[PDB]
PDB file of N, CA and C in Angstrom:
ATOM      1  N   UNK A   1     134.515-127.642  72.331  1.00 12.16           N
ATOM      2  CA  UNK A   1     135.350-128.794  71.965  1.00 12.16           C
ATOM      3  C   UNK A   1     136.751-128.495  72.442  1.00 12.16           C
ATOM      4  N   UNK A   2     137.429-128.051  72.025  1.00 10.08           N
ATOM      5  CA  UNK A   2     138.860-127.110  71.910  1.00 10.08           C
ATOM      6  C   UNK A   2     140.014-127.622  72.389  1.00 10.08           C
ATOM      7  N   UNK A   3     141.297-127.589  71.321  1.00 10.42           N
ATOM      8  CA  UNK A   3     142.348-128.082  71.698  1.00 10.42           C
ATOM      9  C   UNK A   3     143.470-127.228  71.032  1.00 10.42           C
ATOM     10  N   UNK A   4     144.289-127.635  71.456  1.00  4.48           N
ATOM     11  CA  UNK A   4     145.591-127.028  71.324  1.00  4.48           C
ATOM     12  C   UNK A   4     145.657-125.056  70.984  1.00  4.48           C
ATOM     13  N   UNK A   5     147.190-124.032  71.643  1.00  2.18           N
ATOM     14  CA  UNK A   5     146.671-123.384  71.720  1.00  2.18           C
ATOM     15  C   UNK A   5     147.301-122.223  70.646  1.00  2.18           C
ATOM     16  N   UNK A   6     147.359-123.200  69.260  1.00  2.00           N
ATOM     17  CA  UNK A   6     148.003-121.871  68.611  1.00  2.00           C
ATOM     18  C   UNK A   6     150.014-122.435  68.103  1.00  2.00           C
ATOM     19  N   UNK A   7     150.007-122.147  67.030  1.00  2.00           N
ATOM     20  CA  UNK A   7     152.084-122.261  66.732  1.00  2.00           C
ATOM     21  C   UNK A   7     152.333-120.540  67.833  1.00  2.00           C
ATOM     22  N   UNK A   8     151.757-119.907  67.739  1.00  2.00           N
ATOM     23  CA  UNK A   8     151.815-118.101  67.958  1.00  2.00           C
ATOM     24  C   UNK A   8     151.457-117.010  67.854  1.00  2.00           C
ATOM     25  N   UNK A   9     151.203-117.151  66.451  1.00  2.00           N
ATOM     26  CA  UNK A   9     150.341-115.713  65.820  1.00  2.00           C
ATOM     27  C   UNK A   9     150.409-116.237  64.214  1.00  2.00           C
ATOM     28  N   UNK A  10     151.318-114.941  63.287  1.00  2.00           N
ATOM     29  CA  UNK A  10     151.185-115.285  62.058  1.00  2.00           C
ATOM     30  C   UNK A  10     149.809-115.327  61.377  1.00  2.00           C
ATOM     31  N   UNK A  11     150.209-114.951  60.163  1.00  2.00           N
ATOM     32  CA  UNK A  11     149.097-115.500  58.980  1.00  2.00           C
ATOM     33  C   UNK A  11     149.668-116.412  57.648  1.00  2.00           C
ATOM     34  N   UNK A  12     148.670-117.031  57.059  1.00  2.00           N
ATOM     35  CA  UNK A  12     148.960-117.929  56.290  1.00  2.00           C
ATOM     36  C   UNK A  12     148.571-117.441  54.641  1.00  2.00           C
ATOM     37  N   UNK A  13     149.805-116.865  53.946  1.00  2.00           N
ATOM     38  CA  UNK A  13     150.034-116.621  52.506  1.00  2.00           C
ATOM     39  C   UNK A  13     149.141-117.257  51.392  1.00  2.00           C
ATOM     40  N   UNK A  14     148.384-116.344  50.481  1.00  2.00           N
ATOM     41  CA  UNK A  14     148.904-117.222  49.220  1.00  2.00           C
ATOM     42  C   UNK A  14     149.272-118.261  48.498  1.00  2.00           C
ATOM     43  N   UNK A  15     148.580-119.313  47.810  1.00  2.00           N
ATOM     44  CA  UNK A  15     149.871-119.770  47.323  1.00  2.00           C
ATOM     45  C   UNK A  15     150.607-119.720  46.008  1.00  2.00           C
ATOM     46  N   UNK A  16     151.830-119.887  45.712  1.00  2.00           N
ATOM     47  CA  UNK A  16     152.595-119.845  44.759  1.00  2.00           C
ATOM     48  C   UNK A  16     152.726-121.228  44.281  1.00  2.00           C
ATOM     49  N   UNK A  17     153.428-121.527  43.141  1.00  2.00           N
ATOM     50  CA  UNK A  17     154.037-122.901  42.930  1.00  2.00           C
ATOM     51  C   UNK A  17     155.262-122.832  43.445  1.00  2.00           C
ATOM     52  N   UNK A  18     156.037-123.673  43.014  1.00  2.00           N
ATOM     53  CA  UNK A  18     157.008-124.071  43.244  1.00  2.00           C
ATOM     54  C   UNK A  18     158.511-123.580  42.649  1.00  2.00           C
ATOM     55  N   UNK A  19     158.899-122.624  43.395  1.00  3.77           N
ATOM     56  CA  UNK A  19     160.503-121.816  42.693  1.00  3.77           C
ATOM     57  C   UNK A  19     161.238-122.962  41.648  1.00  3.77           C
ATOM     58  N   UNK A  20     161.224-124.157  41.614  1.00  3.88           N
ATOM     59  CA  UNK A  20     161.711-124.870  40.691  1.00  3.88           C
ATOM     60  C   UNK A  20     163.624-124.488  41.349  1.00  3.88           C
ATOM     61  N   UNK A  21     163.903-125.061  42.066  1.00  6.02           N
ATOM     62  CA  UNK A  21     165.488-124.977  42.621  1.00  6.02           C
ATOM     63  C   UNK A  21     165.932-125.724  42.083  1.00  6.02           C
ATOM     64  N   UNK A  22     167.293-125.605  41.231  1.00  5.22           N
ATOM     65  CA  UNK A  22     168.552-126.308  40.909  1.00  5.22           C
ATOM     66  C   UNK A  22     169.196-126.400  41.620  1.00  5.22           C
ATOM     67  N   UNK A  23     170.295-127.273  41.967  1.00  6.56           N
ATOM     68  CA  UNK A  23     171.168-127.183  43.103  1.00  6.56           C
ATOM     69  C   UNK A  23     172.498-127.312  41.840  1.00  6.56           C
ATOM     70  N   UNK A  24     172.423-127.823  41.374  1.00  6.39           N
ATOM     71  CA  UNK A  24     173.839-128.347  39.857  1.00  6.39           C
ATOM     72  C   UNK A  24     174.194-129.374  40.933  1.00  6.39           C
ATOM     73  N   UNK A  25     173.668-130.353  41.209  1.00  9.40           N
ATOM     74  CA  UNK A  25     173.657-131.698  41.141  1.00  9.40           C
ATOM     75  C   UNK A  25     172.474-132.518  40.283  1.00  9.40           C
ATOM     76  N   UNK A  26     172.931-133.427  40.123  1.00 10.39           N
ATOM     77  CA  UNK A  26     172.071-134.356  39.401  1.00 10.39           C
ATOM     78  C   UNK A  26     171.149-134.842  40.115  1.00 10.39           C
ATOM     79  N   UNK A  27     172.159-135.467  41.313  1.00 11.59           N
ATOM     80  CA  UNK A  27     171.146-136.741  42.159  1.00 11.59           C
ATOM     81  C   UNK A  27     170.029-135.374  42.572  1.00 11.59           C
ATOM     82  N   UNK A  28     171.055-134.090  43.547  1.00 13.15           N
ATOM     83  CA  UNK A  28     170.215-133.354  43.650  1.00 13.15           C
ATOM     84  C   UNK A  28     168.840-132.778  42.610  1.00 13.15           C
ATOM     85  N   UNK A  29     168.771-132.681  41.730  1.00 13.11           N
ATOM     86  CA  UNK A  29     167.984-132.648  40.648  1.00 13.11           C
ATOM     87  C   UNK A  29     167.166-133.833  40.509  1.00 13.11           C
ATOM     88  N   UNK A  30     166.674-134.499  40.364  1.00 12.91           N
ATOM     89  CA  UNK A  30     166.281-136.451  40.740  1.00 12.91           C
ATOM     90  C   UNK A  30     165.477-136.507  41.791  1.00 12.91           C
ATOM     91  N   UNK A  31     166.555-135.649  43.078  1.00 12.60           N
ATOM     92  CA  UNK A  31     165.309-135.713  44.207  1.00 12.60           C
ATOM     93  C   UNK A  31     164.585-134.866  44.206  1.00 12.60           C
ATOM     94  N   UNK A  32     165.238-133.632  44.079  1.00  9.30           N
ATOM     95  CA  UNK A  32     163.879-132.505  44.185  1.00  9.30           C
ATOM     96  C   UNK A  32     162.832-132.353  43.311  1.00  9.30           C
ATOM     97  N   UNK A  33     163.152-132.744  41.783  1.00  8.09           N
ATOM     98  CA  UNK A  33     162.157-132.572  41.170  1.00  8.09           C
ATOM     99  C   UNK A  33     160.874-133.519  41.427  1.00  8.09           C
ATOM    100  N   UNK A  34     161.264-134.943  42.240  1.00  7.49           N
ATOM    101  CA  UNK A  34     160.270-136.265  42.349  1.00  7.49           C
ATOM    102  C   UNK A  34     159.653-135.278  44.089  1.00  7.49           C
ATOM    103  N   UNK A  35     160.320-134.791  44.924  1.00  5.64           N
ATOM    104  CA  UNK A  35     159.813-134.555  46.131  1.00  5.64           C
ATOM    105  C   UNK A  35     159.185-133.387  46.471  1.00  5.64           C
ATOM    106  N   UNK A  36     159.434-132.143  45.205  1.00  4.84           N
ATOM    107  CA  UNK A  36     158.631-131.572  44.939  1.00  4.84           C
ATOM    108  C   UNK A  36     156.912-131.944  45.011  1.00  4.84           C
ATOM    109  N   UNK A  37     156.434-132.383  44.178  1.00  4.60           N
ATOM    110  CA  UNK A  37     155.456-132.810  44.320  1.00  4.60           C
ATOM    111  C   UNK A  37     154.719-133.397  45.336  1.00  4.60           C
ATOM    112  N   UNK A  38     155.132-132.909  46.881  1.00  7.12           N
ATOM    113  CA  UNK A  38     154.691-133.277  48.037  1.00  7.12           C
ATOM    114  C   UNK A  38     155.160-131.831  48.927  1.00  7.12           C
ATOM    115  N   UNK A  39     155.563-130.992  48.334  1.00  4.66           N
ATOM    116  CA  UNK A  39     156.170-129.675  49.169  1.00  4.66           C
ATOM    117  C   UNK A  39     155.558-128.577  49.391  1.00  4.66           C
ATOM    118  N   UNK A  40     155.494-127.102  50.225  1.00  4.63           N
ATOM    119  CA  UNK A  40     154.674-126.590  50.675  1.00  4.63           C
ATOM    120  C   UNK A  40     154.158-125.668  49.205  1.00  4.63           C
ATOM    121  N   UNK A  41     152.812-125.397  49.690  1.00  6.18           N
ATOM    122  CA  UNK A  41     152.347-124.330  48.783  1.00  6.18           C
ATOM    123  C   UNK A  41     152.095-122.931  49.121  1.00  6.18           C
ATOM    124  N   UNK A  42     152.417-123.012  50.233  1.00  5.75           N
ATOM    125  CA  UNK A  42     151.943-121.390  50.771  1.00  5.75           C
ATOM    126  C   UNK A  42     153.229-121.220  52.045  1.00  5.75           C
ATOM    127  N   UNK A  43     153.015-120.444  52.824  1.00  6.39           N
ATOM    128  CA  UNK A  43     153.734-119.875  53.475  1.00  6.39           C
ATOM    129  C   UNK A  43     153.195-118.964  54.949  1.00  6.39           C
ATOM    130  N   UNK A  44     153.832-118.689  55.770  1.00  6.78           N
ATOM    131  CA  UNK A  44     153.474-118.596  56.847  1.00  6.78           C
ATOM    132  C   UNK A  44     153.774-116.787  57.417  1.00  6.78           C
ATOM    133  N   UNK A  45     153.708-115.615  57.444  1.00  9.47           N
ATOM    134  CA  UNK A  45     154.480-114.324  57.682  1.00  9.47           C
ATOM    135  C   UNK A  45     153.114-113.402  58.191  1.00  9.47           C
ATOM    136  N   UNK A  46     153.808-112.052  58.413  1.00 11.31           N
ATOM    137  CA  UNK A  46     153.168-111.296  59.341  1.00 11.31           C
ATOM    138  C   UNK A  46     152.239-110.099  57.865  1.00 11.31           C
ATOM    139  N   UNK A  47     151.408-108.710  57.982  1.00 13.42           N
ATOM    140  CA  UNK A  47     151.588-107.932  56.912  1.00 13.42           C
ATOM    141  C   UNK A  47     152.864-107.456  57.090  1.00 13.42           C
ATOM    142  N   UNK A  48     153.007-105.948  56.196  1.00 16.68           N
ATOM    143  CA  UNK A  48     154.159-105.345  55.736  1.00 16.68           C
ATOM    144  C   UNK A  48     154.114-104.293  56.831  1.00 16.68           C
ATOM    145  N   UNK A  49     153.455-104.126  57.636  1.00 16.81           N
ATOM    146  CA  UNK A  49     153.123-103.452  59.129  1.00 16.81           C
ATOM    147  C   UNK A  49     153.691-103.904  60.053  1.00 16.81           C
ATOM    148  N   UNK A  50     154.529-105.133  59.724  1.00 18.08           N
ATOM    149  CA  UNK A  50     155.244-106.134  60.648  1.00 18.08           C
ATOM    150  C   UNK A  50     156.708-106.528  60.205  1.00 18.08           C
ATOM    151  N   UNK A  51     157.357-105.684  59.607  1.00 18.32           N
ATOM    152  CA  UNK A  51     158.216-105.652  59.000  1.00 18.32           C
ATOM    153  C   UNK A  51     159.759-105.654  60.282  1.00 18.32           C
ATOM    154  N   UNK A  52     160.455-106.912  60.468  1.00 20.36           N
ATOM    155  CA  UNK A  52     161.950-106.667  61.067  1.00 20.36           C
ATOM    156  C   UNK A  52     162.629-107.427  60.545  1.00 20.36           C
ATOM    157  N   UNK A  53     163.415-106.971  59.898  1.00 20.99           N
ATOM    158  CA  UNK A  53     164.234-106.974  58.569  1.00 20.99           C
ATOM    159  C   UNK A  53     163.854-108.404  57.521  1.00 20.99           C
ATOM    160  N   UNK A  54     164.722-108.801  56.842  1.00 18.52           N
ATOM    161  CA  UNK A  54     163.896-110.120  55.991  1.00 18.52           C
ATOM    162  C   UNK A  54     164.465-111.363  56.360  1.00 18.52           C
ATOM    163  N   UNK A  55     165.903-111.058  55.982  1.00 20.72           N
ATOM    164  CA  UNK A  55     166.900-112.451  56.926  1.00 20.72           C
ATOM    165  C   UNK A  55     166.405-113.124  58.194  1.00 20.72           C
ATOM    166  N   UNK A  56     165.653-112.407  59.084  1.00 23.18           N
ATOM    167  CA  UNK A  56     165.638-113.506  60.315  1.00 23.18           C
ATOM    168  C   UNK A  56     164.004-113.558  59.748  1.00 23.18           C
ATOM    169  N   UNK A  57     163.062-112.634  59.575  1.00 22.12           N
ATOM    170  CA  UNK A  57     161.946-112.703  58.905  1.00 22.12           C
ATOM    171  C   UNK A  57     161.688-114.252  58.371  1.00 22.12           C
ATOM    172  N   UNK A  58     162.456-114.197  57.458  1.00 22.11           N
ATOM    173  CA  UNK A  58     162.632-115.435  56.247  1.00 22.11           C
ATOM    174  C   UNK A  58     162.921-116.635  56.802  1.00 22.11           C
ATOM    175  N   UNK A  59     164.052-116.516  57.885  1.00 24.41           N
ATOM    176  CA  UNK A  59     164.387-118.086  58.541  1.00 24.41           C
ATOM    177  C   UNK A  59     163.323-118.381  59.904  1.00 24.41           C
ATOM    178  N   UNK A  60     162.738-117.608  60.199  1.00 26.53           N
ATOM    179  CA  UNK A  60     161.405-117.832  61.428  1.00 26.53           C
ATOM    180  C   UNK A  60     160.249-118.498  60.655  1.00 26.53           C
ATOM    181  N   UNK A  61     159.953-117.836  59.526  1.00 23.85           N
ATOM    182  CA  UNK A  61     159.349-118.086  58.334  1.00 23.85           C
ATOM    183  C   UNK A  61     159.428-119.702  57.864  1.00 23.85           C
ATOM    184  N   UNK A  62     160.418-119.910  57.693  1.00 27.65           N
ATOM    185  CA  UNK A  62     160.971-121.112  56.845  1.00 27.65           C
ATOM    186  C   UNK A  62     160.680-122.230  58.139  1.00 27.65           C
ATOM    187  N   UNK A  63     160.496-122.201  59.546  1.00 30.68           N
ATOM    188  CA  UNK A  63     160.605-122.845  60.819  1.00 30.68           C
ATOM    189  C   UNK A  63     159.569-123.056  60.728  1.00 30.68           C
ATOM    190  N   UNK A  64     158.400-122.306  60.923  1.00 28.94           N
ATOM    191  CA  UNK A  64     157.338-122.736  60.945  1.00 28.94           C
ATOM    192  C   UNK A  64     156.752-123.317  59.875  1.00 28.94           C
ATOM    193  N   UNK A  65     157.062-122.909  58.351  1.00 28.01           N
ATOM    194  CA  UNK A  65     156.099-123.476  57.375  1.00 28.01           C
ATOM    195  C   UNK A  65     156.545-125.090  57.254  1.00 28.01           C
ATOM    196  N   UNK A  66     158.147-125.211  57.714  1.00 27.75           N
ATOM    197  CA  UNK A  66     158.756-126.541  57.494  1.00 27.75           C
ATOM    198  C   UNK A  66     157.729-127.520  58.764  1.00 27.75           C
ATOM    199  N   UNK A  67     158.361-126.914  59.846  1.00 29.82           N
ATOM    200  CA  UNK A  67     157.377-127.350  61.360  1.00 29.82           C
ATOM    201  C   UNK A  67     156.355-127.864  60.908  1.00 29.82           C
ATOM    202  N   UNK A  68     155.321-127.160  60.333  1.00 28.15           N
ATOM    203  CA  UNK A  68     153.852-127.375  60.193  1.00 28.15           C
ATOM    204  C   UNK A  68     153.838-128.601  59.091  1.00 28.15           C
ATOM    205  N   UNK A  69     154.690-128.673  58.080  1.00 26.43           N
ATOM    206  CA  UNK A  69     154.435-129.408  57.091  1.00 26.43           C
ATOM    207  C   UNK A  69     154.947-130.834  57.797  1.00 26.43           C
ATOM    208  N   UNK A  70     156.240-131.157  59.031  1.00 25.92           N
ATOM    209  CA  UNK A  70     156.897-131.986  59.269  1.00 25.92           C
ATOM    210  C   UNK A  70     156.070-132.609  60.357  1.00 25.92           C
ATOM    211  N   UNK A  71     155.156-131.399  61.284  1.00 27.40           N
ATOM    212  CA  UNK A  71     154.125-131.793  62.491  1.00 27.40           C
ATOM    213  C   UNK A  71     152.991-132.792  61.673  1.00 27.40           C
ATOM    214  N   UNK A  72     152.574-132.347  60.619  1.00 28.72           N
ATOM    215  CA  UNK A  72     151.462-133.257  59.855  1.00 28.72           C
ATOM    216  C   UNK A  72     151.799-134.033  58.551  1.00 28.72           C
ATOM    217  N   UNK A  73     152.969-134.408  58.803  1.00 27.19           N
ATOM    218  CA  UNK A  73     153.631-135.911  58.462  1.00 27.19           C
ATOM    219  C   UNK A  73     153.874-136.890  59.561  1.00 27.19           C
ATOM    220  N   UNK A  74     154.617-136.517  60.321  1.00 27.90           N
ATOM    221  CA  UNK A  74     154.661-137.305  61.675  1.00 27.90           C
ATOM    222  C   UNK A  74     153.883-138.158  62.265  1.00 27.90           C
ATOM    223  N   UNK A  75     152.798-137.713  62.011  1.00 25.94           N
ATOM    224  CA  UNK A  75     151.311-138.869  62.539  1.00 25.94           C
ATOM    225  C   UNK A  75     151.597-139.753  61.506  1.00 25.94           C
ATOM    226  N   UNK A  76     151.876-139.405  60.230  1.00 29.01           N
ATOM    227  CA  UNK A  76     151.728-140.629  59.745  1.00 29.01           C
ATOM    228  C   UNK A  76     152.791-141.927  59.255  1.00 29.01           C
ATOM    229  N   UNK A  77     154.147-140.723  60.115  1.00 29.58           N
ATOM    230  CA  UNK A  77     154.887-141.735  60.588  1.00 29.58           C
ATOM    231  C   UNK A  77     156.256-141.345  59.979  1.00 29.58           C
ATOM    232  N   UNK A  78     156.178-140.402  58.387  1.00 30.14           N
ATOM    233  CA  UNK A  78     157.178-140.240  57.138  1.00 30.14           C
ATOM    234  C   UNK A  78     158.572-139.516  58.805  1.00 30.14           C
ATOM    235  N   UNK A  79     159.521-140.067  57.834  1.00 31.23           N
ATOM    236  CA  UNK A  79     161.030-139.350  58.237  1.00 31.23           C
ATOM    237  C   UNK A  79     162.195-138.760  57.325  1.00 31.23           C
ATOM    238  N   UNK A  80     161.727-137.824  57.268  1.00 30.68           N
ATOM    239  CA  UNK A  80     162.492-136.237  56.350  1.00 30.68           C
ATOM    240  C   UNK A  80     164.303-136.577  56.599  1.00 30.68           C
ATOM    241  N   UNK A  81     165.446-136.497  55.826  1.00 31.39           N
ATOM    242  CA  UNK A  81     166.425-136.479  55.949  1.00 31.39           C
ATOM    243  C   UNK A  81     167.280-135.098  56.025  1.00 31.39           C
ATOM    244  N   UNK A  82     168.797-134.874  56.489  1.00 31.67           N
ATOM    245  CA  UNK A  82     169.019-134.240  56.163  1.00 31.67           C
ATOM    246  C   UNK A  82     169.071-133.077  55.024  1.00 31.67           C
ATOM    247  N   UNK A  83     169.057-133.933  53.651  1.00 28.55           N
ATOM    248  CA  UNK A  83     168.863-133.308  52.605  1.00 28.55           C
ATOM    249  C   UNK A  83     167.435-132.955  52.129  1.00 28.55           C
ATOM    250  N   UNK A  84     166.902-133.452  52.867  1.00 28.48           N
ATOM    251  CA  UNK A  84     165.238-133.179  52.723  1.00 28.48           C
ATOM    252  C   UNK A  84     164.721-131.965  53.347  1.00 28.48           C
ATOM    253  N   UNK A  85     165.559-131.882  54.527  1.00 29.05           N
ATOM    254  CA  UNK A  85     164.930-130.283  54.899  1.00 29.05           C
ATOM    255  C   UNK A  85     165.768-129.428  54.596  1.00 29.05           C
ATOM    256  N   UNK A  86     167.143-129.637  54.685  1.00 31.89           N
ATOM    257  CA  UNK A  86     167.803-128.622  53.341  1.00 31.89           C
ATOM    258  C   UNK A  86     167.158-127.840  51.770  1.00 31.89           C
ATOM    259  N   UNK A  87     166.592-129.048  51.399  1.00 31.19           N
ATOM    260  CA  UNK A  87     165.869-129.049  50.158  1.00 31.19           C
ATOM    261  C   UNK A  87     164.681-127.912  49.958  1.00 31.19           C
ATOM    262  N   UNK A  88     163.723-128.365  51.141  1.00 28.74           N
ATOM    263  CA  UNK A  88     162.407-127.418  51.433  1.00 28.74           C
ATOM    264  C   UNK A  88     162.982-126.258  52.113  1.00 28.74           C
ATOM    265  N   UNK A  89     164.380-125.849  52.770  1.00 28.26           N
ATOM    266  CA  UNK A  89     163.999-124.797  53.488  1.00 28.26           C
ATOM    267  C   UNK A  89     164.553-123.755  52.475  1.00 28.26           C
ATOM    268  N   UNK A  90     165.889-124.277  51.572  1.00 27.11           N
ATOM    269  CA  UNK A  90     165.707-123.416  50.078  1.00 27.11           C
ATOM    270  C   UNK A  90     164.262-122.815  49.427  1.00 27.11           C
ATOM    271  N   UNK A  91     163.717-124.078  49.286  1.00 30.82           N
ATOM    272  CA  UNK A  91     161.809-123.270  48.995  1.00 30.82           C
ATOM    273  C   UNK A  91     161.180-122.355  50.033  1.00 30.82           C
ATOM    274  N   UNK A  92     161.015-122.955  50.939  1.00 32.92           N
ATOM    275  CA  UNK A  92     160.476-122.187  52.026  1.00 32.92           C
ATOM    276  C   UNK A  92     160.767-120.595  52.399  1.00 32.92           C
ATOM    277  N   UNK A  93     162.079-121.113  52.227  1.00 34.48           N
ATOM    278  CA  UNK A  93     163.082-119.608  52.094  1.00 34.48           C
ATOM    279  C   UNK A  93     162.662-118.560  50.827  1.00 34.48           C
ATOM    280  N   UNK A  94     162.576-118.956  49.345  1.00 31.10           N
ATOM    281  CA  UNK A  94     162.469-118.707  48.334  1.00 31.10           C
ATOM    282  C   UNK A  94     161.004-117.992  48.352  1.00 31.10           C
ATOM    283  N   UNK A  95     159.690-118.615  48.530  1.00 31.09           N
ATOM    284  CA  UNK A  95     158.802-118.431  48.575  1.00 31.09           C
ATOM    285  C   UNK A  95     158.722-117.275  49.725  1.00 31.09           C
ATOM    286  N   UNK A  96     159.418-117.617  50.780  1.00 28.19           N
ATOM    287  CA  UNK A  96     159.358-116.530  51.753  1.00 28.19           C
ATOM    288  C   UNK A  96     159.525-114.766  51.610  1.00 28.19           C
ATOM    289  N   UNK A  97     160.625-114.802  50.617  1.00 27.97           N
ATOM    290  CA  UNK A  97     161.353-114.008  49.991  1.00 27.97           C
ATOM    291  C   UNK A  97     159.942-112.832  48.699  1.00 27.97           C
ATOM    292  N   UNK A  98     159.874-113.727  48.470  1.00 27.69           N
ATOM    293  CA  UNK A  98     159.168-113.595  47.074  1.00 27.69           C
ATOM    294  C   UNK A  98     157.417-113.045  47.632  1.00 27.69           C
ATOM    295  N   UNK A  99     157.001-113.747  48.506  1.00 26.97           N
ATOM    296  CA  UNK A  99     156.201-112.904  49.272  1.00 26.97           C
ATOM    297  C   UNK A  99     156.213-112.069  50.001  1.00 26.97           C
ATOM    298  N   UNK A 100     156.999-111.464  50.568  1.00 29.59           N
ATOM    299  CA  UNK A 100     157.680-110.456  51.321  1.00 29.59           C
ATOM    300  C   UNK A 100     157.725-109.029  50.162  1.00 29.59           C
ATOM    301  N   UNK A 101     158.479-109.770  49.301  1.00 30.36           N
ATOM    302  CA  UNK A 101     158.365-108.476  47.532  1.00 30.36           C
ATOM    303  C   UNK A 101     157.334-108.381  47.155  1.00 30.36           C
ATOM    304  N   UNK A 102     156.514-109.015  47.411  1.00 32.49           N
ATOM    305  CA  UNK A 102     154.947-109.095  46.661  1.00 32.49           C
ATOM    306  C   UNK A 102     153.318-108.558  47.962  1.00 32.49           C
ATOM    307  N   UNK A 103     153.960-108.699  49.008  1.00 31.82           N
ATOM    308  CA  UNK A 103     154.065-107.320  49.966  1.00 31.82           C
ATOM    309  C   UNK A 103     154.372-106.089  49.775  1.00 31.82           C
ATOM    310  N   UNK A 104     155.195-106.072  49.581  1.00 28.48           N
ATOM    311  CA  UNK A 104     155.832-104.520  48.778  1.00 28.48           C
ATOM    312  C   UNK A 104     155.113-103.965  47.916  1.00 28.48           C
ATOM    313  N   UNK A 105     154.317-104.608  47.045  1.00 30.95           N
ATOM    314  CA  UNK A 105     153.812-104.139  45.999  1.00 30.95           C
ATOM    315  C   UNK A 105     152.675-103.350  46.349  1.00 30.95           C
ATOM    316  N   UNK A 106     151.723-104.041  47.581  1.00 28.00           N
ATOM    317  CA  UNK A 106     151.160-102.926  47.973  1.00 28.00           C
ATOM    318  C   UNK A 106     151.391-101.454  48.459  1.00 28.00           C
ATOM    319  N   UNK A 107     152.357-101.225  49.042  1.00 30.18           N
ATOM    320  CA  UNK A 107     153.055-100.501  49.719  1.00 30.18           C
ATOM    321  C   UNK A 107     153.397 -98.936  48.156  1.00 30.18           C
ATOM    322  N   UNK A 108     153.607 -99.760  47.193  1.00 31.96           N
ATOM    323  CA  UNK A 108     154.123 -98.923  45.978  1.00 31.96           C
ATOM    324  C   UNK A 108     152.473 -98.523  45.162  1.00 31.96           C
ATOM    325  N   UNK A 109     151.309 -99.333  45.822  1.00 30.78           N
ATOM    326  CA  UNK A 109     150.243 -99.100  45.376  1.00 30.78           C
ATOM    327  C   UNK A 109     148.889 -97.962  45.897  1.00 30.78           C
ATOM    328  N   UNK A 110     149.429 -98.471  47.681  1.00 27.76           N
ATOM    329  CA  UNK A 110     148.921 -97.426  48.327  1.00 27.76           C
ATOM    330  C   UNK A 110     148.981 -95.998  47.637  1.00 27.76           C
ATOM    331  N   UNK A 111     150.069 -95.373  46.937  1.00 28.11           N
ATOM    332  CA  UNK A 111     151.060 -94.438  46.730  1.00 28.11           C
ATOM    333  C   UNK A 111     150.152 -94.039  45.443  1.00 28.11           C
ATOM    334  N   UNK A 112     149.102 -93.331  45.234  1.00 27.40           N
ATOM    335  CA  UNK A 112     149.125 -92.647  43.878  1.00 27.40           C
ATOM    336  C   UNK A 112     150.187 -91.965  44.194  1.00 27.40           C
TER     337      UNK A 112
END
């Protein structure tokens, strides 16, 4: 059959819920909590064998899981705003983070 050839590599996380982000806005608060409920659940990263540093880690991270979520909206037409991918890449970021530490944990487990 076969099409298309791949985002790159990567593997696909876990999932977590949702970090629950405040921004200390209201409106901000209003939207995220209603747009939440359409936002990613998992995440996109390498193992802990693949480790270069977390900062760019995290924002390569945050590109693709946003990408992927924004590539399979697009067909159906939705258009994300500024504050909308601001919004998710705080999560994206967050979740990114948080799996990366939860990586680690093996690492402290290997270890009798």
């Amino acid at each position: 059959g076969s099409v298309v050839g791949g985002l790159g590599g990567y593997m696909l996380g876990s999932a977590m819920s949702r970090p629950i982000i405040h921004f200390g806005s209201d409106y901000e608060d209003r939207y995220y909590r209603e747009n939440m409920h359409r936002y990613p659940n998992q995440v996109y990263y390498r193992p802990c064998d693949e480790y270069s540093n977390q900062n760019n880690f995290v924002h390569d991270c945050v590109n693709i899981t946003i990408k992927q979520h924004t590539v399979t909206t697009t067909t159906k037409g939705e258009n994300f705003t500024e504050t909308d991918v601001k919004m998710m890449e705080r999560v994206v970021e967050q979740m990114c983070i948080t799996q990366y530490e939860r990586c680690s944990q093996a690492y402290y487990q290997r270890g009798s």
